[PDB]
Amino acid sequence: GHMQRGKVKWFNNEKGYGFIEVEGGSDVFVHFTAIQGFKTLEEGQEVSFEIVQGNRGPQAANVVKL
Amino acid sequence: HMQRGKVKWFNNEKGYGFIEVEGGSDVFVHFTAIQGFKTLEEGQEVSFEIVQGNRGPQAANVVKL
């Protein structure tokens, strides 16, 4: 098994989604349901996560804060 | 008003991709937004509106120019 690593580009805590920045690669969509932690995502937090293919494209899963 | 841009890429198996806007952020587009008989292809110039969907801004009313 492996994981992706990056940092929260932005996360809107009213809307419930944002994107993760991956150095050299595409941003990855992240929904609030993908957050494994106690607290919500905030700009700049480094995260480990995996990418799953949703109906409308890739998105983050199992997002943990490093 | 309508935005204008050009197809950056469109995954023709899954039905999604992005429209690039000059000096602007990319806009996500889904095959259901296409106002025409044919799919989107790289480099096609398009007009479109932006509406709010499940992933934020997405293209709507996409017409090939």
Q: Can you give the residue ranges of every domain in chain B?
A: 1-65
Question: Which of B18, B25, B54, B58 to probe the A interface (max A CBs under 10 A)?
Answer: B54
Helix-then-strand count for chain A, H and E: 0, 5
CATH number attached to the domain at A1-66: 2.40.50.140
Residue B43: other Cβ atoms inside 10 A: 10
CATH architecture, domain B1-65: Beta Barrel (2.40)
What token pair was written down for A12?
Answer: 């809107």
User: Cβ of B14 under 8 Å from any chain A Cβ?
Assistant: yes
How close is the nearest chain A Cα to the Cα of B1, in Å? 25
CB A17 within 8 A of CB A30: yes
- Resolution expressed in Å: 1.8
Q: How was this structure determined?
A: X-ray
Helix/strand/coil (H, E, C) string of chain B?
CCEEEEEEEEECCCCEEEEECCCCCCEEEEHHHECCCCCCCCCCEEEEEEEEECCEEEEEEEEEC
CB A47 within 8 A of CB A65: yes
The count of residues in chain A is 66
Measured distance between the N- and C-terminal CA atoms of chain B, rounded to whole angstroms: 15
